[PDB]
Every structure is written in C-alpha cells, then in structure tokens.
Amino acid sequence: DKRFLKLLRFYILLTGIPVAIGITLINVFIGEAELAEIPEGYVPEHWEYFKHPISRWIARTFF
Amino acid sequence: VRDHWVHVLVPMGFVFGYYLDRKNDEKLTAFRNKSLLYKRELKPNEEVTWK
Amino acid sequence: YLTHQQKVLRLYKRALRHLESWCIHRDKYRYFACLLRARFDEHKNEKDMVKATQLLREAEEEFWHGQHPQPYIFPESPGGTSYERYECYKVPEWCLDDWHPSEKAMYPDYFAKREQWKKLRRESWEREVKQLQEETPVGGPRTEALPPARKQGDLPPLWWHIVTRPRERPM
Amino acid sequence: QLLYITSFVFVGYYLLKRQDYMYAVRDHDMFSYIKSHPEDFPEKDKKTYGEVFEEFHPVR
Amino acid sequence: MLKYIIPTIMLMPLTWLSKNNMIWVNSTAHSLLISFTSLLLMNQFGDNSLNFSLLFFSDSLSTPLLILTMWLLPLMLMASQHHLSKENLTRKKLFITMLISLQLFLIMTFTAMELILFYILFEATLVPTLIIITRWGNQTERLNAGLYFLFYTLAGSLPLLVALIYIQNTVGSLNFLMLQYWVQPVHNSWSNVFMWLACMMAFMVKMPLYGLHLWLPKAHVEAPIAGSMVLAAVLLKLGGYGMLRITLILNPMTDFMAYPFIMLSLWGMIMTSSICLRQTDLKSLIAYSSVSHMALVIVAILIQTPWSYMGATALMIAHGLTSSMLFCLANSNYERIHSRTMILARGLQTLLPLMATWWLLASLTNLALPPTINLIGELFVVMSTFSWSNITIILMGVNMVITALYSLYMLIMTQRGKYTYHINNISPSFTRENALMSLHILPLLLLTLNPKIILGPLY
Amino acid sequence: SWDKDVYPEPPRRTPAPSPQTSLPNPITYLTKAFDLLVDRPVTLVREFIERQHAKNKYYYYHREFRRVPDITECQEKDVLCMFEAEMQWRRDYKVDQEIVNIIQERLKACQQREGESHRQNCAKELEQFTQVVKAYQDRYHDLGAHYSARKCLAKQKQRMLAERKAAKEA
Amino acid sequence: WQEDPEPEDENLYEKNPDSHGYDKDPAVDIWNMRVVFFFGFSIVLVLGSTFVAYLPDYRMQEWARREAERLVKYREAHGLPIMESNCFDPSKIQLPE
Numbered sequence A: 001d002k003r004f005l006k007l008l009r010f011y012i013l014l015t016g017i018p019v020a021i022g023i024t025l026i027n028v029f030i031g032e033a034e035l036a037e038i039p040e041g042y043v044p045e046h047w048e049y050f051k052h053p054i055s056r057w058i059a060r061t062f063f
Numbered sequence B: 001v002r003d004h005w006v007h008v009l010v011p012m013g014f015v016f017g018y019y020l021d022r023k024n025d026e027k028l029t030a031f032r033n034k035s036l037l038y039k040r041e042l043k044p045n046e047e048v049t050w051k
Numbered sequence C: 001y002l003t004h005q006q007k008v009l010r011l012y013k014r015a016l017r018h019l020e021s022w023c024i025h026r027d028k029y030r031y032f033a034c035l036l037r038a039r040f041d042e043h044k045n046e047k048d049m050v051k052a053t054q055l056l057r058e059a060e061e062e063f064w065h066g067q068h069p070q071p072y073i074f075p076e077s078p079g080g081t082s083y084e085r086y087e088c089y090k091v092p093e094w095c096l097d098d099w100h101p102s103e104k105a106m107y108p109d110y111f112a113k114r115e116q117w118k119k120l121r122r123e124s125w126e127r128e129v130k131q132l133q134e135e136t137p138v139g140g141p142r143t144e145a146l147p148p149a150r151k152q153g154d155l156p157p158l159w160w161h162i163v164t165r166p167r168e169r170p171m
Numbered sequence D: 001q002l003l004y005i006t007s008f009v010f011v012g013y014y015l016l017k018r019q020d021y022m023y024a025v026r027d028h029d030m031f032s033y034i035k036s037h038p039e040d041f042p043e044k045d046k047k048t049y050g051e052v053f054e055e056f057h058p059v060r
Numbered sequence E: 001m002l003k004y005i006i007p008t009i010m011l012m013p014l015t016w017l018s019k020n021n022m023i024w025v026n027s028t029a030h031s032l033l034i035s036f037t038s039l040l041l042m043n044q045f046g047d048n049s050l051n052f053s054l055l056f057f058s059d060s061l062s063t064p065l066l067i068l069t070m071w072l073l074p075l076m077l078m079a080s081q082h083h084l085s086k087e088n089l090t091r092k093k094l095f096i097t098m099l100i101s102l103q104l105f106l107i108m109t110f111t112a113m114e115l116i117l118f119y120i121l122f123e124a125t126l127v128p129t130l131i132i133i134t135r136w137g138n139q140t141e142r143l144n145a146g147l148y149f150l151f152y153t154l155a156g157s158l159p160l161l162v163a164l165i166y167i168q169n170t171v172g173s174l175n176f177l178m179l180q181y182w183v184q185p186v187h188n189s190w191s192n193v194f195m196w197l198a199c200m201m202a203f204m205v206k207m208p209l210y211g212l213h214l215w216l217p218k219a220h221v222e223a224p225i226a227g228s229m230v231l232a233a234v235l236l237k238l239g240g241y242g243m244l245r246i247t248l249i250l251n252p253m254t255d256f257m258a259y260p261f262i263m264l265s266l267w268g269m270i271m272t273s274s275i276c277l278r279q280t281d282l283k284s285l286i287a288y289s290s291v292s293h294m295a296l297v298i299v300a301i302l303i304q305t306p307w308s309y310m311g312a313t314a315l316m317i318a319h320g321l322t323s324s325m326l327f328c329l330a331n332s333n334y335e336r337i338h339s340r341t342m343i344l345a346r347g348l349q350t351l352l353p354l355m356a357t358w359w360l361l362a363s364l365t366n367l368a369l370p371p372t373i374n375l376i377g378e379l380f381v382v383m384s385t386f387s388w389s390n391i392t393i394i395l396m397g398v399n400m401v402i403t404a405l406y407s408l409y410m411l412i413m414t415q416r417g418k419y420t421y422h423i424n425n426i427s428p429s430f431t432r433e434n435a436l437m438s439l440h441i442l443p444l445l446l447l448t449l450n451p452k453i454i455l456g457p458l459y
Numbered sequence F: 001s002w003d004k005d006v007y008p009e010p011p012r013r014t015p016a017p018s019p020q021t022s023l024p025n026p027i028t029y030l031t032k033a034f035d036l037l038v039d040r041p042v043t044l045v046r047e048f049i050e051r052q053h054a055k056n057k058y059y060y061y062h063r064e065f066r067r068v069p070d071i072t073e074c075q076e077k078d079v080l081c082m083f084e085a086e087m088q089w090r091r092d093y094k095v096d097q098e099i100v101n102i103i104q105e106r107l108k109a110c111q112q113r114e115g116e117s118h119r120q121n122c123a124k125e126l127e128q129f130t131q132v133v134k135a136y137q138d139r140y141h142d143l144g145a146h147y148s149a150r151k152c153l154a155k156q157k158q159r160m161l162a163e164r165k166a167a168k169e170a
Numbered sequence G: 001w002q003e004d005p006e007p008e009d010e011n012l013y014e015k016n017p018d019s020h021g022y023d024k025d026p027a028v029d030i031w032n033m034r035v036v037f038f039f040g041f042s043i044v045l046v047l048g049s050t051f052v053a054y055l056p057d058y059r060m061q062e063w064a065r066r067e068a069e070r071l072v073k074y075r076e077a078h079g080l081p082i083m084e085s086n087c088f089d090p091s092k093i094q095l096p097e
Ligand SMILES: CCCCCCCCCCCCO[C@@H]1O[C@H](CO)[C@@H](O[C@H]2O[C@H](CO)[C@@H](O)[C@H](O)[C@H]2O)[C@H](O)[C@H]1O
Pocket: A018, A019, A020, A021, A022, A023, A026, A030, A052, A053, A054, A056, A057, F056, F057, F058, F059
C-alpha cells in the first residue's frame, strides 16, 4: 500500500510540477489579453476571441 | 528498430485519421463565406476564409 | 443439556447479579444477598425431584418479574460497552507470511523464532491427525471434546489456533 | 495473396460501375417522369412560419 | 471522427503483431493515448453541435459518453489480464480484439447522425458482448445469460427497425440534424401508440426499465469482469442515449404515453433498492443497484425538462464510473476467494487497509454524497420531478434513504466486523488493483471541480 | 473593473470614528499590522507582475453576431434558413438567461447591502426582478427539453391569440 | 474421466515479492506498471485536467455574460425594457382568423 501511494504521488508530480510551474511563468511573463474594440476593417482570427494565453493556444492549435 | 516498430501504428492511425477528417471538410465547402451570419469580403491576400 | 443442579446454580448467580443491580450500595447488597441465599438453603435438601422442579420453575417466573430492566454488565462481557472493542486490532498470524522481505528484516529475531514454531507445527501435524483417528469411535465423535497428548514429545491435537490466537490487547 | 487482392479489386471495380450506372438511370427516369407529368408534381406555394399555425404543447 | 476510428482499429494489428509477452503493455499504453486525444471533442459550441461530416457528429450529449467509452478500454484491459493469465496466447488476443471491436462500435454508435446507422451499430454491440460473456464467462449459466441478453434486446430492437424505416419513408430522412427541423407533432391514434412503443421499448430494455430488468442480474453474475465493466459503464447508456435522441420526434404523445413507464420507474427504483438489502451475491447486488439508478434516468428522460436532461446526462456518466468501480472492487475479492457471496469474507478492512478506502469512496459516490457528480445528477432529477408533481419527493426521498442503507450495508458486511477465520489467502493488494481503483475514482471526483462538461446539451 | 451602470452601487457613507473610551482600539492597531505585513508585500508582488504584463500587451475581442432572419421569415421545411434562424434564437436564449442572472445579482447584492432595512430599500431591484422574470417566463418557460425557435413561436402565437380574444371580449 | 485435475491457484508474490500484479515476468511486470502510471496519471489525468480547465469558453458561457451586460447597459441607457415578453416581432406574424 505504501509503495502504490508513493508511485501514485511520483507520477502525478512528474508532469504536475512542470505544469504548475509552466502555468505560473505564463501568467507572470505573458499575462492575459486586454479587452479591446474590434478595429474598423479588421477581422480577428477565431483564437483572438479568448483572453487566457493557454485558452488561445488551445483554440489556435486544435480547435 | 524491429523491436519497437509496432509503437507507430496507433500514432500513424491518428495522423491518417486526422488527415482524412480534414480532406472530408474540403467536400463540404458549399457555404464557405456564404452564410448570412459569417459572410464577408475577402482579406487583401486571403484566398479562402477557412479550410 | 443442563442438569437440574446446573440450572439451579445458574439462577442463583443470575438472581444475585440482578439483586446487585437494584441495591447498588454494597452494605445493602450484602444484606439482601444473604436473605436470597437463605431462600436457596431453605430447599437445598428437597429430595422429591418433582417438587424440586416446581420450585425451580416458580423461582424462574419470580426472577422474570423482578429482574432489573437494565442490569449491570461487565464492560467486556457480551452486550457490554467494551465488548468486541479490540477485534479491529486483532490480526491473524498468517498475515506475516505476506510481509515484504524488507519488513521482515526489521525483526530478524522475531521471525527466526517464528520459523521454529512453523517447523514445530509441520512436524506435529501427522501425529495429531493419527491420534484423533485412532481415538474416535466408528460413527465419528459424539462430543466436541479433544484429547490431550499421550506420549512425551507429542502436542495435543489441534493446538495451533488456540496457542497462537491474537492477544486480548494486541496493539 | 496478391491475386486475392487483385481479383477482388478487378471484379469490385466493374460492380461499382454498374452500381453507379443503375442509380444514374434511376434518377434519369425519375426526372423525366416528373417533367412529363407536371400536373402530378405541382410546385406548391410555401408559407413562412410566421404565417403557418402550429399548436403549442407545453411541457410542464 | 476518423481520427478516433482509425487509431482504434489500429489497436488490432498492434495486439496481433506485438511480442508474445507485450500484448497487455502495448494495448493498454496505446488505448490510453487514444483516450487522451478524445478530449479534443470538448470543442463544443453554445448553439451548434460539432458536425464533422455527413456520417458523424458530436454534441454535448455524445462527447462525455465518448470519453467514458474510450477511457474504459484501458481500464478493462488492466482488469482482465490477471484472470486470463493461463489462457493461450491466441485466445488472449481474440479477447482483446473483442474489446477493441466493442469500442469501435460504441464510438460510432454515439456519433452517428443517421438513425439507421445508429441502429446497426447499436445492434452490432450485441455480438462482441455476447461472445465475451459466453466464451470467457466462468460458470455453466453463462450460456443462458447470453441467450436472455440476446433475445431481450432483439425482442425490442426488431420493432424499432420497423418504426425507423417507417419514419424515414414518411419524413424522408433519419438524419438527426434534419429531424430537428422537419419534426412534426405525433397525433393521437392507435397507429401512433404502437409507433411510440416501437421507438422506445428497445431502449427501455437496455436501460433497463423495471419489469424488463431480470436479464441484467443474470448477465452480470455470469460475465467476466471486463464484460461487467462495459455492460454497466456504457452498454446500459445506449438505451439512455437512444431515448434522449428519439424523444425529439415523439411529442406531444409522450405527455401521456410516459405515465406507465414513470410509474414503473418511480416504483421500480424503490423495489430494486429494497431488493439490494437482501441480496446474497455481491455482483447481483451491484446489478440491482444499477437498475435503481437507471430508473431515475428513465424518469428524467420521459418528463423532458432542461433540468432533467442535465440530470440524466450527469447520472449516466457518474453511474458508469461508480458501478464499474464497484464491479472491480467485487472482482478483486473474487480473485482471492473465488466466490461472489457477500457474507463469505468479512472484516477485510483489517487485512486490506487501502483497498477498504476504495470501498468507502465507491460507496459514498453510490449513495450520492454532495458534491459528487452522482449527487449533482440525482439532485437535478429530483428538482425537476418535483415540478412535474410535488408528491414524487416522497418516493425520491425514500429511495435516497434505502440507497444509503444498502450502500453502507455492503461496505459494513465485507469490510468491517471480524475477519473470517478460515480464509487465509488474502494477499496484499497489487499495484495493478490499486491503480485500477484509482483510475475510476480520481476522474470521477475531479469532475466535481468542473461539472459543466458532463451536463449535456441543455447546459 | 466592471461597468458601474450594469452593476450599480450607491455612494458609500462611512461614519468617522467617534471614540468615547480611553482604551486603544485593538482593531486599529491590527489594521496597521495587516497593512504593513500583509497588504504592502502583496502589493509589491502585484506591481512586479503588472510591469511584466505591460512589456507584452495584446488584445482579445468580444464577438459580434450579425442579425439574420428569424424563424418567422423562414419558409416551412427550408432547413438552410431555419438553421441560421434557429442558431440565432439559441444565442439569444443564452443571453436572456444571463440578463436574468444580472438582475438577480442586483437583487441579492441590494438585500445584503441594505441590512435590516432591505425590505423598504430594495423595492426597485425587486420590481425590476419581477418584470424580467415575467418576460423571461413568457418567452421560454414550458417549452421542454427539445425546445426550438418553432416551439417558442407556437407559444407566442398562442399567447397573442388569447390576448386578442380577451381584448375582443373587452 | 480422462480429465486434468484443477490446478492450484498461484500467488504472484511467492516467486516475485516485488510483483506489481501485472505479469509473472519481473521485467514485463515493471514496464506494464510504468505505462499505466505514466500514460494514465502523468498524461491523461494531469494534462487532461489542465486541458479541461483552460477550454476556450466552453459553449460560449462567458460570451453570453459579456453580451448580456452590453444589452443591459444599452437598454437601460435608452429607457427600453430589459427584456420583452415577445421573442418575435409581432409585425412579422400573422395570426389566423
Ligand atoms: C503549463 C504548460 C501548459 C502548456 C500548454 C500551453 C502552451 C502555450 C503557452 C502560451 C504560449 C503563448 O501564448 C500566446 O502568447 C501571445 C502573447 O505573448 C499571444 O499572441 C498575441 O500577442 C503577441 C505578442 O506576444 C502577438 O504576436 C500578437 O499580438 C498576438 O498573436 C497568443 O494569443 C497567445 O496564445
């Protein structure tokens, strides 16, 4: 039982810690988008309608 | 490597399936840039709105 | 199953304990416990077993009327407050067989002596089975009593689970 | 194994051609009949939903 | 959907071309990668469903069922590999092939636009499921369980085939997007009463509806563990998913045709919950628990309100993970004591401490402890049926009391009390078993932090 | 931060401290400790993060949906027009749900803000809540889980017919 | 009759006290443990949970709130009703009779 919990904790932290660090660095050194009026004659890309950089990246990349 | 070549089958299936999904969209462009909601004029160097 | 003598003695113990639950105070209990003993001694020599049975039957109806609805129970007796309290901590000995070798390494002396008990159990088993086989009437045992070991160097048949049972306060 | 695939593909190719021809013939026949019998296939005048009345059935 | 169909198919050559001893490693690893990619289906819009092509589409209803389907395959592979260890290699590969083909039919079933395509794939799931039960089940009765499973389903599905073909002739299409716009009201007549029944009874047998449920306890008692997991987690939900879709074209006739089936489900859930208190077979108890839970789903689907459709979707997902977990917990005991009797092995918390925690967590979700998605779904159904009729709160309330009673009774009987003296082969929990339990409960409890993705199209 | 007109608040009126005791107020000194030990270090961290955001400034927009013909203008069974009209009706339905949520949030904030005087002081919020709920109920309530623009229209025409008949009899 | 006896049940811990329960071969047993834990926990549950948390406005729930604020601001500024009983313009409707 102790071994399983140790293994479970290790593999969750294996990607969890890098993801937690990556989210923090993204939020600090990139930040969220600022709401702006659509400039006249400008057609935003579909991924420009979302505020968070990770959300924009998901929309731009996969969706 | 002959030991670990089977590990490309499923990933290649996904790439091929992703590929076939995109070609299937190309047969469904009857209304690209023709809907009342999203119809507009093409951007200065733009050839199609989506693909 | 119970003899007449056994039934009388069980009533006498039972009535005293319920009398004790009513009286509470020791001096009061001592006084009434003596009167109750006197009533039992009033018919100790009744030789007519038909009359003796009726006296026992009437005493049981008298007990049922006068029993304490909430008698004292020793904490660890059945129905007591501590009954079965430590069953959760009792672990059978065979679980140690499944310990990882690293866990076993922390008690090298305990597990050395444990092997000597397992060896003793293995080398005793065939005698125990053969002793019971040759002491049992044809139609199987008639009672649950087990025999003692007859020879020197023999162990009483079916001893392992009695001798190695969990301790009453195992943790 | 090579001839199994080739045999199936070869026969399958011609069966597919006949299949597509028979459905084209079916459509060709159907449109000609509609053309030759306009009285049985009138162009009905369609109304909008603002004009058409549909009963409302509340779900409550 | 081809980005999921093709990789699922590729699991078959992967299994057959794997090294002899790497069949479980390879198929488990790659079916988890497929499960990972299934999260791309979360690209759901507020107005339009995700319509890939003429054949397949996803919306908020099918997406959570698809992810549950694709997550369950790797779990079924870990669950099965121990009791199949003495099987010869070719027969192990055939077993894995049946599981892969079942996933292929399921992901196509949940995404088909056209209702005859749904019917065929919905029916195709019978073949592998029957093969798994009858070939790899343990005891003699598995042959009868296969027959009851097959013929209960076909007695309902064949009338559905007639009704669907009838509908296409009249309407001109069975594409579900078209039916959303061309649907016409069903007027009262004896013809439409039987059209309504032909459209629904097949799905009711799948749920299963109370009174048509007796096939389910037989199938579970006889099926291998993977058969139970897919049966409980996904196969029952084909009935729910089918009813959620086909009720579109049965209005307003559903207003009164639902009453006999609401009474069966409202009363049936109390009777099956009470039955669970007296069951002696642990797999049979869990099977009856499923009938009780699915009774709410039937009621929610039949009363047709936004809250009930959200409750129905959440319950279907929550029940799938919980019931599959309970079967896995019951199986892990079975693989030690080789008996399903609930009273045989007691006091197991003393011998298997961590596995007793999985039992506790599984039981808490089964009795719907807030804020689990099990409660969210059940609460939403209870809210909506109260508006349907205030009196139903009494039946719902009584069921929640009895549900807690048998959920904890199952926990108390197997995990607490005194361990059975003569059972001495209770070896410690394997890493495989602990990982299997945690791969049910962890996704289930993580969904509490973001329930919207399992609330369906009406969210 | 947010539009003060959409989410109005009254002008705050705090009373100045008016001590009538010689004992020091422990809250006053705790406030100084909180400002020095908690708020000040927190503010410095935010100001650092705000500097990084300024270096990388980018925008996102609010999607604007062109109006399209609604279900009343769609010919029967013309799926292409019904589709655009139906998707529009669904978008407005999700917007009206949020309008009711905004009004409910005004009502809830007023009740908490006004304290024991809330029954009198929150009348306007209560009345506005009552009206928007009535309008929302007329539009969408009782449509069922398979709601659509068609069913919404059928419900409106039923209401309009009852309103015309009532005036006719009046 | 001519039937093999029923084999005794095998305890995987006897030959391999370090068994993970996956396979009797220790090397395969360990690999099968790693794929389950890495692809199951490290990837699907950790990355999948992160993916779900940052979905771009699932079903335009956020857009509808921004849109509702825009409409409420405009309609109150101009003295219009916040919301109307009629969803569809009665001028586009034609009642029977
Ligand atoms: C925790 C690990 C998680 C890994 C998954 C996430 C990977 C992506 C991390 C964020 C990558 C940067 O994300 C991206 O940043 C830039 C802003 O800098 C944005 O881009 C926008 O601003 C940049 C300026 O920087 C300009 O090119 C332009 O104005 C516009 O494209 C993108 O809209 C956003 O999506």
